[PDB]
Design a protein around this ligand. Structure first.
Ligand SMILES: [Cl-]
Ligand SMILES: [Cl-]
Length: 370
């Protein structure tokens, strides 16, 4: 890519970690989700592929510096597509049933937690397995990557694991944290070193990412779900199943809450002006200011489960259980929609040339530049 991938812009505060900086889109979460790319995509479909998947919390494709598109399917395949939709490679017999983002790290390594209770290290050039890490339970998050390359995942047996790769073929366990409750809020990391996660026992955790010790915790009446975003102040914005977005300061004070009219249904984005974006079971996609006032909302006919993606012009792309892909401008006005035949739940991704990828339970869709 001609410019480097950065997790942060001037208004976000993720802990900078060892993602592939030459990739177009190396991670779905643990970053602002404001793309550095512009797009002239107008809703015309460039191509579609059959990719059966059940992505956890809006997981989906990653795109490297060549524009190669990597995506897991629930038949146990990881597939690398060329930009024109032809297949570059396929690796089989990985996990089934639920899918996760094939996150692109340094040294051309793909980090793919898998439902077979393994965290695979995979060569992105060939798809060959470099090694795998046994997990005590099936993973429930994408791999977040820290500054020293440590991988942070939640697992379904109520753990956060910190696994440190020591080369493309070797690894050691940094720490593990047994959580009180099923993890619904996947690990994301903030610039002061804190890892944030939360459970359906209503506990929101701030954890020292180096040591695995809890710095502080807060409680609510229902569980947080998905991937929070973090601003430059270290404030964490997390969607709650009680129907509110919560903003926690870096000390654990409640900065504010905002009503979503339904259970939170997507993970978040944050733009360089500090506005945060989230989908609701109400069908709405919200834009909310850093002080917690509504900028706008856009109404779809079903829960919005894609984490929205902002482009460099402030347009916002997302999908709905009403089976439409959506594009709106920075003021919330519709640009275009595209009707597909499956709920749109696999979050959007932007290539350097403006191609937009987004997925359903059955297909990967590519929307081309105009
Ligand atoms: Cl380069
Ligand atoms: Cl509290």
């Amino acid at each position: 890519a001609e410019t480097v991938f950065k997790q942060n812009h001037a208004a976000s505060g993720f802990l900078a970690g060892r993602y592939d900086a030459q990739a177009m889109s190396p991670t779905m979460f643990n970053w602002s989700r404001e793309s550095r790319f512009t797009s002239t995509a107008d809703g015309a479909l460039k191509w579609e592929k059959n990719v059966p998947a059940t992505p956890q919390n809006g997981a989906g494709a990653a795109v490297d510096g060549d524009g190669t598109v990597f995506i897991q399917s629930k038949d146990g395949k990881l597939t690398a597509y060329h930009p024109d939709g032809t297949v570059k490679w396929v690796t089989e017999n990985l996990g089934t049933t639920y899918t996760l983002t094939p996150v692109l790290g340094t040294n051309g390594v793909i980090y793919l937690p898998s439902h077979d209770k393994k965290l695979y290290f995979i060569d992105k050039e060939t798809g060959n397995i470099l090694t795998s890490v046994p997990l005590s339970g099936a993973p429930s998050s994408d791999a977040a990557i820290g500054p020293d390359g440590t991988l942070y995942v939640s697992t379904l047996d109520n753990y956060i694991y910190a696994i440190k790769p020591t080369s493309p073929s070797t690894w050691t366990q940094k720490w593990k944290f047994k959580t009180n409750g099923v993890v619904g809020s996947a690990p994301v990391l903030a610039s002061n070193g804190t890892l944030y996660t939360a459970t359906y026992n209503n506990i929101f955790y701030a954890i020292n990412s180096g040591t695995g010790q809890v710095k502080w915790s807060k409680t609510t009446s229902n569980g947080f779900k998905g991937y929070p975003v973090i601003d430059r102040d270290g404030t964490v914005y997390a969607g709650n199943q009680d129907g509110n977005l919560y903003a926690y300061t870096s000390t654990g004070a409640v900065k504010w809450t905002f009503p979503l009219n339904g259970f939170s249904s997507s993970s978040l984005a944050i733009d360089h002006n500090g506005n945060v974006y989230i989908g609701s079971g109400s069908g709405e996609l919200f834009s909310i200011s850093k002080t917690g006032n509504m900028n706008w909302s856009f109404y779809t006919d079903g829960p919005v489960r894609t984490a929205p993606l902002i482009d460099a012009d402030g347009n916002v792309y997302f999908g709905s259980d009403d089976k439409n892909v959506y594009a709106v401008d920075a003021d919330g006005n519709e640009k275009w929609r595209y009707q597909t035949d499956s709920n749109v739940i696999s979050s959007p991704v932007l290539a350097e040339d403006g191609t937009l990828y987004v997925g359903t339970y059955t297909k990967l869709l590519a929307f081309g530049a105009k």
